[PDB]
Design a binder for these strands. Structure first.
Ligand SMILES: [Mg+2]
Ligand SMILES: [Mg+2]
Ligand SMILES: [Mg+2]
Ligand SMILES: [Mg+2]
Ligand SMILES: [Mg+2]
Ligand SMILES: [Mg+2]
Ligand SMILES: [Mg+2]
Ligand SMILES: [Mg+2]
Ligand SMILES: [Mg+2]
Ligand SMILES: [Mg+2]
Ligand SMILES: [Mg+2]
Ligand SMILES: [Mg+2]
Ligand SMILES: [Mg+2]
Ligand SMILES: [Mg+2]
Ligand SMILES: [Mg+2]
Ligand SMILES: [Mg+2]
Ligand SMILES: [Mg+2]
Ligand SMILES: [Mg+2]
Ligand SMILES: [Mg+2]
Ligand SMILES: [Mg+2]
Ligand SMILES: [Mg+2]
Ligand SMILES: [Mg+2]
Lengths: 187, 225, 128, 53, 147, 125
RNA sequence: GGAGCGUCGGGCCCAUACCCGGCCGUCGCCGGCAGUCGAGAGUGGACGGGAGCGGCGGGGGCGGCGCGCGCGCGCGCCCGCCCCCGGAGCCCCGCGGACGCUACGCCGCGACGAGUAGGAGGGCCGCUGCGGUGAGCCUUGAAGCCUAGGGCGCGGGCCCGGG
RNA sequence: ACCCACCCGACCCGUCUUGAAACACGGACCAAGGAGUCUAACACGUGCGCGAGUCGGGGGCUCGCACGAAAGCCGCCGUGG
RNA sequence: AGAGGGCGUGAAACCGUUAAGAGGUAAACGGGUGGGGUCCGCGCAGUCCGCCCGGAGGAUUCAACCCGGCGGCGGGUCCGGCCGUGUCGGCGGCCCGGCGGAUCUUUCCCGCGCGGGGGACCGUCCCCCGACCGGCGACCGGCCGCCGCCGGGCGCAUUUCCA
């Protein structure tokens, strides 16, 4: 008899993508290979991200991709995003970029290409740079989802600012006993 | 193209074979030295006492540096403070053992697990027999048997420890690099004690097997290793 | 002089008797078919000494000889002639079973074809 | 009983609602019927706009 | 797809995943939002702070269309018009400034979030913010009230 | 591609046949009857297939052109070899090895031909 | 003259505990393999001038970074070569690559495996009907039924023989 | 795998229970039947499509529906959510 | 009629018999052997096949080699032409290229400041040839090399067959 807890012996990370789609799975076959045979950890990070959920690979807006490449020095590079590239209607002038993405929305595609931008697929990125050399690996804001505003220290727990799940906002949906001082108390 | 490369590859081949020979010769001389070192250690303890005894004097030799610690009772109904220390000595299963350098900190940790272990001061031969018969590396967290020095070297060679013999000298003299050589060794899975024990549950002093038995840990080692 | 398989190792089985279902002996309503007991007290399900055994993955077959017939082959249940020609390039490792529902005319048609291709049949001398 | 976080929600299934469930298996059959009836009315008001006034 | 659901995997087991000390009885809490004050209170007042109690003024015959006032931010004002108004402008050389009827596009108020590009406009709208006005002037434009 | 359409097909094709813990495949110009990527007649730009001759004597090799698949009528190109066993193999060998065509296959193609030439002779006692 | 009681020896007895080995599964390994040298790896390769038995004349270190299977060499004859795998013949081969590669595949190393309530995963386990699909099976005998017949699977179960 | 013998092991299941072989209840035997369903609402997770949008209803245009009460299309494509 | 008028199939409980075996600790069960039965596989030697080789016997025809024909592959000179990506030149399709636009013009036209249609303009989609480059599985034609098949020749130190 041995004393170990077998409690957290199984690591819960993903191995493959849970999706069954065939084009992504080909990318996975390609980046598994590169991951293992190259020294590049870029390939490993990319590989890891191909297995993740929709939630877990959030969309990267065009404006966010602009400003991250506006940063000093990462000039004449390629931005990479395992998610999708979306438009920003609240940005106007779009520099000529180099981009990798699993998806780019039709607007975002036009705007970039009109600028003299190049768009790449991930099979194309590999041939272009199999060890991820000269890349900017970005990500969309993970904690964008409105979901997260309900997460945390519960509402009605002093110093929480945590959206309650409520049928409809309005004068008479919550905001009585436990928010006003006038009505019982407040947190 | 062809005959130039071939000779270059043959040259390479040879430069390896030369180096192999060299490192082998180092190993061979390192042992020979350690043979002389242990001889010198043994005699020069007797030397001392005889010289005290010549005068009306005493030679109180050094208190021991290093001790082997065997877990001699099982893994049921064991107090949480004991249990923690037993898994700070890596003594998880029953009849696992470890070398342990002694000092105020270490000794007291053995004091908190006394009726759960048999321990004491191993012989030279004990350190050899344990290492050669049951010497297993921790090599990428896989218990792997020390079949060659290429294993020991690969892991401990950044300390000057390049062979089984070096390892034995680091363990037995409790060198600078003891912590790292001792942790490299996977804890010794020894069999049951042949000829049996006296009594599991009681201390050595009082007839049983537990606690410090100092010199006599070596007898137990032989009947288990 | 039957068709020898490529390699005829020693199959070695961990357990030969069927695991049978608790109290299938006592009752005609209970069938031999194994069922794990879920009873709160249950001699069997809590592994007492002297009781019927519970199947584990412990009893599992060795992967080399799992599904290996005594003869050394694995079955493959052929349904008509066309379906045989698959085995053409195995023959030394797989044999052909013919199905129960196949007629005694075309049972014959299969058997002679397998005899050309040297695929061993596991129920040939039968329908007649 | 509520369990840890969720909309404290009021469904209106306390009356005998299954007595008054109104299915829509008609609707295709309906949609046609209107459409026939529509084409008939055109044909009746011969050169007049199908629209109406 | 019953095939996939949990009751298929519970077949054989006695309690059906509801335990055997306590069982699956009918309504052990009370039905629904029962006990909001008593015996379910803690859940109510640690996930629904402010359920209980009145507050504010009643309003009898509310009609929502009176208070209809959909807003738009300067952020994306140029989005309302075809790019070639924003292009034929930063060009032209008359200092023209094209009109943007915001009420046409379905927003009544113009609030002031965001940077407006240095490029004159005439924004026609039912209502404006203070800041939205200011930003518009700073671009070198003119806010315009409409009924 | 080859790989893309293997993704579409791997588990669903009419030619496949699971059952009895094995799997197989019945698509034509698959020597070895495997539901493999390698050994699949339909998928690959260059294909080998060694069937027996309809005569009952001999073997047919079945190359695929590359000229134009899209036009299956013209795509495969058959060739009977009805020669002294040892020769037959060598002709197949050269077809495969010295044309640099489907080099992966080739030994499987030889064993198939061999087994076919086993098939067609006086049987037994 | 214990087969009693107190003190102590040797010796022997056996648990699912410990050790070694087999086999099954699970976990872990930034695990390996989409076809390459390489085992404390501590380089490889142009290419130009100047030359040659020269070399890089550094620690009782006991040694790893440098040395004795060649660097230049045997052949063509001090000068030239030091040549190509469609052929070096291979323990490594960078020219092309499994018997192997259903990449949801295949392979290797370690570790571990009680379980109610409960949870999750996988079931080429099982039932009935639908779209597809098996140039499936079936009066030369389907379903069901029965079987001291033959087997497979850890098992749910399954397949064959005879009736 | 049928029967028999012998050595060792071995109390009857289900269940509520801190505790069941119980002097606790249910159960003579066999066959068939027999219990976590569906709708609605919410939340989180996951898969797919599109993405500052998205959406399909409801309605309409295309057929006697064999398959269709499907399928397709709509400045209705967005009244509206 | 092993379908006989409540009759297709005809399970189990339960009963009768026939056969076999047992029998003082209620039966039944798990593990482990033994004995007997039932069938099943044999063998009237199972010495099981397959390569390659050596020998001694018979056997027909060819490999090797060219020659003629067909088909296939691969290649570069991209040689010649079709093919298409990125770029530049034609402002050439632009009206013989259409849609879209809150871009413009009511110098226009038609219908009643508005609707429809022109006409500018911008965005997008197509012709002409030249140049550079990815020369891309997107194809043809010749030439080359290699492979395979058919037919010619090659009569036997080759060539398969058979025992
Ligand atoms: Mg556990
Ligand atoms: Mg205890
Ligand atoms: Mg105790
Ligand atoms: Mg209990
Ligand atoms: Mg109307
Ligand atoms: Mg539950
Ligand atoms: Mg219950
Ligand atoms: Mg409860
Ligand atoms: Mg377990
Ligand atoms: Mg359970
Ligand atoms: Mg109770
Ligand atoms: Mg009680
Ligand atoms: Mg009980
Ligand atoms: Mg009692
Ligand atoms: Mg009761
Ligand atoms: Mg009763
Ligand atoms: Mg039933
Ligand atoms: Mg969701
Ligand atoms: Mg009848
Ligand atoms: Mg009847
Ligand atoms: Mg009937
Ligand atoms: Mg009798």
């Amino acid at each position: 008899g041995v004393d170990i807890r077998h409690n957290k012996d199984r690591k819960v990370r993903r191995k493959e993508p849970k999706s069954q789609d065939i084009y992504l799975r080909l990318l996975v076959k390609l980046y598994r290979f590169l991951a293992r045979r190259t020294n590049s950890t870029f390939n490993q990070v990319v590989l890891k991200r191909l297995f993740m959920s929709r939630t877990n690979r959030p969309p990267l807006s065009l404006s966010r991709m602009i400003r991250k490449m506006k940063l000093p020095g990462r000039e004449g590079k390629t931005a990479v995003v395992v998610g999708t590239i979306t438009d920003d209607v609240r940005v106007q002038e779009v520099p000529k970029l180099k981009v990798c993405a699993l998806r780019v929305s039709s607007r975002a595609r036009s705007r970039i290409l009109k600028a003299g931008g190049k768009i790449l697929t991930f099979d194309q990125l590999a041939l272009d740079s199999p060890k991820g050399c000269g890349t900017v690996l970005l990500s969309g804001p993970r904690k964008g989802r409105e979901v997260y505003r309900h997460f945390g220290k519960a509402p009605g727990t002093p110093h929480s600012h945590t959206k309650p799940y409520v049928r409809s906002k309005g004068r008479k949906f919550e905001r009585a006993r436990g928010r006003r001082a006038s009505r019982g108390y407040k947190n | 193209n062809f005959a130039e490369l071939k000779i270059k590859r043959l040259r390479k081949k040879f430069a390896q074979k030369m180096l192999r020979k060299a490192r082998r010769k180092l190993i061979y001389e390192k042992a020979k030295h350690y043979h002389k070192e242990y001889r010198q250690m043994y005699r020069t303890e007797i030397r001392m006492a005889r010289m005290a005894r010549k005068a009306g004097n005493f030679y109180v030799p050094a208190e021991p540096k290093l001790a082997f610690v065997i877990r001699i009772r099982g893994i049921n109904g064991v107090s949480p403070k004991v249990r923690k220390v037993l898994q700070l000595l890596r003594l998880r299963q029953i009849f696992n053992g470890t070398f342990v350098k002694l000092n105020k900190a270490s000794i007291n940790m053995l004091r908190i697990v006394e009726p759960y272990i048999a321990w004491g001061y191993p012989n030279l031969k004990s350190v050899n027999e344990l290492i050669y018969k049951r010497g297993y590396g921790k090599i990428n967290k896989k218990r792997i048997a020390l079949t060659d020095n290429a294993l020991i070297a690969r892991s401990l060679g950044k300390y000057g420890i390049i062979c089984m013999e070096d390892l034995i000298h680091e363990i037995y003299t409790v060198g600078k690099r003891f912590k790292e050589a001792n942790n490299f060794l996977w804890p010794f899975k020894l069999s049951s004690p042949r000829g049996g024990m006296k009594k599991k549950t009681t201390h050595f002093v009082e007839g049983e097997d537990a606690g410090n038995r100092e010199d006599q840990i070596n007898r137990l080692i032989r009947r288990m290793n | 002089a039957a068709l020898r398989p490529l390699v005829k190792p020693k199959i070695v089985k961990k357990r030969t008797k069927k695991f049978i279902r608790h109290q299938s002996d006592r009752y005609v309503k209970i069938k031999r078919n194994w069922r794990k007991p879920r009873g709160i007290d249950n001699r069997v399900r809590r592994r007492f000494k002297g009781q019927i055994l519970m199947p584990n993955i412990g009893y599992g077959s060795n992967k080399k000889t799992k599904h290996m017939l005594p003869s050394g082959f694995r079955k493959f249940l052929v349904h008509n002639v066309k379906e045989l020609e698959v085995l053409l390039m195995c023959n030394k490792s797989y044999c052909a079973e013919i199905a129960h529902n196949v007629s005694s005319k075309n049972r014959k048609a299969i058997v002679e074809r397998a005899a050309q291709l040297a695929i061993r049949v596991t129920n040939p001398n039968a329908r007649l | 009983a509520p369990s840890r976080n969720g909309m404290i929600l009021k469904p209106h299934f306390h009356k005998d609602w299954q007595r008054r469930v109104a299915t829509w298996f008609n609707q295709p059959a309906r949609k046609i019927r209107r459409r026939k009836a529509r084409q008939a009315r055109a044909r009746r008001i011969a050169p007049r706009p199908a629209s109406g006034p | 797809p019953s095939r996939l659901r949990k009751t298929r995997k519970l077949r054989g087991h006695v309690s059906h995943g509801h335990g055997r000390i306590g069982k699956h009885r009918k309504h052990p809490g009370g039905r629904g939002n029962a006990g909001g004050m008593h015996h379910h209170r803690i859940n109510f007042d640690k996930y629904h702070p402010g359920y209980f109690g009145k507050v504010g003024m009643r309003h009898y015959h509310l009609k929502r269309n009176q208070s209809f006032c959909p807003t738009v931010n300067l952020d994306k004002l140029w989005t309302l018009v075809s790019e070639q108004t924003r292009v034929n402008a930063a060009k032209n050389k008359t200092g023209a400034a094209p009109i943007i009827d915001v009420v046409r596009s379905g927003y009544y108020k113009v609030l002031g979030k965001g940077k407006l590009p240095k490029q004159p406009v005439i924004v026609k709208a039912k209502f404006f913010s203070r800041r939205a006005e200011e930003k518009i002037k700073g671009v070198g434009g003119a806010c315009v009230l409409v009924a | 591609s080859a790989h893309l359409q293997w993704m579409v097909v791997r588990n669903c094709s009419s030619f496949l046949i699971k059952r009895n813990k094995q799997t197989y495949s019945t698509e034509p110009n698959n020597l070895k009857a495997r539901n493999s990527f390698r050994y699949n007649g339909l998928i690959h730009r260059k294909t080998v297939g060694v069937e027996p001759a309809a005569d009952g004597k001999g073997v047919v090799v079945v190359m695929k052109r590359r000229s134009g698949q899209r036009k299956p009528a013209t795509s495969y190109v058959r060739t009977t070899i009805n020669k002294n066993a040892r020769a037959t193999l060598s002709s197949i060998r050269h077809m495969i090895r010295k044309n640099k065509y489907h080099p992966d296959l080739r030994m499987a193609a030889i064993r198939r031909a061999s087994a076919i030439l086993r098939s067609q002779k006086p049987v037994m006692v």
